[PDB]
Amino acid sequence: PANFCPPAKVNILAQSRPLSEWPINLVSKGVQEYVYGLTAAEREANGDFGTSRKSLDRWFARTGVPTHGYTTVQGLNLILRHTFNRYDGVIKKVETRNEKRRSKATRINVSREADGLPPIEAEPEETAFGPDGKLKERPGINPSIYCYQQVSPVPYNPAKHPALPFSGVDPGAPLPLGTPNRLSIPKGQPGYVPEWQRPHLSTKNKRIRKWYARANWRRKPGRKSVLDEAKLKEAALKEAIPIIVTIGKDWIVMDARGLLRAVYWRGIAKPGLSLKELLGFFSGDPVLDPKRGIATFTFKLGAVAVHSRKPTRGKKSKELLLSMTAEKPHVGLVAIDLGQTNPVAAEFSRVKREGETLQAEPLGQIVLPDDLVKDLTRYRRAWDATEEQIKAEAIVQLPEECRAEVVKVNQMSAEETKHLILDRGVSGDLPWEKMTSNTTFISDHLLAKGVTDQVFFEKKSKGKKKGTETVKRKDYGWVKLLRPRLSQETRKAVNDKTWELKRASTEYVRLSRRKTELARRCVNYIVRETKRWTQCEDIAIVIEDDGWDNFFISKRENRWFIQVLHKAFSDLALHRGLPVIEA
RNA sequence: GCUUGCUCGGUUCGCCGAGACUCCCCUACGUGCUGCUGA
DNA sequence: TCAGCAGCACGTAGGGGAGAATTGGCCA
DNA sequence: TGGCCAATTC
To answer: Distance, angstroms, CA A460 to C1' B35?
Structure first.
């Protein structure tokens, strides 16, 4: 039973007026402002809006919320339902924490009563509402327009709104295909492939780009080309696939080529399909974001044959393997030990059904291919650069009282560390290069000079063994001694300040998307190699859950791709139905 | 068996080589590794 | 052996969304 | 009659 509905995004070509001026947006905004600004008693009082005309009209009458001319039941049932569910979402967010605390309290109290100890006093349950009765965590306005059956997208016709500078395809005719034979384009004409490039052209089912695609002309370091946005815009607009959504007197026109590419790359259809049946692979209820200008379509329930599973763990995994091998008794596995050296390590095996037991048969071991490792390294360099820039900006814009403290924290060089150490009677002939975090050569030198008071001794518990161990203070411990810290008050401030600027810079989101895409590339490569190495269509992913001065600085590359690769591998259960054995 | 958009590269600048495709709102300040303490 | 608490690292956590078949008033 | 678009509803 296919149950996943992935998205597809299309661009908006022409509007009657900005979406923020439509009555549906205004009524949504008003309803949300009303509901989020009322008490618990009023929510019960103002909660009989119903799913009917005779109830919605009275709700808008007594509450006083302006209807702004929007009086559609099928589009208001979404607005009211979403608003009240968002209202109820804070309450149960608080309730979940409350019931976690209640579960720990119940277990601790019953254990104490079994041991004879009286139950401990329970913690004061946090409340979702404030003093007067309003919600402390007030939800914000959702700036989205949810289309409905009565305003479903339809192919554009000249006898609909003839003011468009566009054209319109026949909804029943086959959709146009791109440039069929690019090698026969005359010289000096757009799309011309020069002779020298012709021998080394690609032979796979690569996505064809038109000559006016912005990816072909974007301002790159080594392009030596000129970008004319108007020319590419008009060239693209001459060959669009327009669809239209009409809500009341307003309308928007969307370019359906995004839907076309979505259906082509997924293989749910073949070239030679009409606009009526292109729209039939998606729901009739897209979502509009006015700030961007994107219409997000969602695949209809059945277009993508993905049964979204969840990452299994423990006993259930054994029966998962048994069920998989019961139908097809040849199942492939990949063991991703991504902790060591190169980002991804694999271990393929083919497992059969021995009645009730498993007999794994190894099939090899590979690593992440080199040509992808350069891409990962390039991304890491770019991400380090942008992280340094955003951190520097956050420090610069920090409040002056915290600015001075942070700046003074960030001068702790080796010479500055050595200065006060030498001032403490320590000689400079120490092997400064040769310390580790465990060495005590400074303490040994101080003791050899008779300086016993300065060498502080720490009593360390011997784990499970009773007794405390007296040890000379670590040299790295002396390093902590020389450096004052931010007393976990300024650290809070800089964290909140860097989160905001990290959200705000348009580069950080771009490199976050790039990290996600690179992780997905790694996962896709491993999945394809698992299929090719095991010769089985059904597979399963068994994931298993220098220098002295360099010790002063944080580790540049210690654990970066681990979490993103783990998330990408766990996403196969959510997006593509691949079983994931987290062990 | 691939026309828009997005990401990364090559170039004779004419376009071509390689990618991702579960995404949106919203509200918080957390999730951490650990170094010590009590069973 | 897992339960709190201090200096350190980066996004984490968790609420809310992402229809469509049938039908009744409906005038020409 | 049959057509058209809101309005019920799960």
So the answer is: 10
> Cα dist. A339→A335, A399, A537, A545, A561 in Å?
12, 39, 27, 10, 9
Distance of CA A567 to the CA centre of its chain: 9
A242-247, strands of its sheet edge to edge: A145-146, A287-289, A294-298, A7-15, A250-255, A242-247, A154-155
User: CB–CB of A331/A317 below 8 Å?
Assistant: no
Contact present, A23 and A69 (Cβ < 8 Å): yes
The nucleotide whose C1' lies nearest the CA of A391 is: C10
Contacts (Cβ under 8 Å, ≥6 apart) of A566: A338, A543
Alpha-carbon dihedral angle through residues A45, A47, A49, A51, given to the nearest 10 degrees: -150
Q: Is-contact A87 A81, C-beta < 8 A?
A: no
Give the distance, in angstroms, between the CA of residue A21 and the centroid of all CA atoms in the same chain.
31
The answer to whether the beta carbon of residue A298 comes closer than 7 angstroms to any atom of strand D is no
- Give the closest residue to A153 by CA, choosing from A263, A273, A281, A285: A285
Look up residue A3 and give its amino acid. N
Instruction: Assign A183 to helix, strand or coil.
Output: helix
Instruction: Report d(CA A581, CA A542) in Å as an integer.
Output: 4
Judge if the beta carbon of A51 is closer than 7 A to nucleic acid strand D.
Answer: yes
This structure was determined by: cryo-EM
Indicate the domain borders of chain A.
19-143, 308-412+489-583, 424-482
Resolution (A): 2.8
Q: Which residue is nearest to nucleotide B1 (CA to C1')?
A: A270
* A8 CA to B22 C1' distance (Å): 9
Instruction: Give the SS3 label for residue A14.
Output: strand
Alpha carbon distance A189, A554 (integer Å): 55
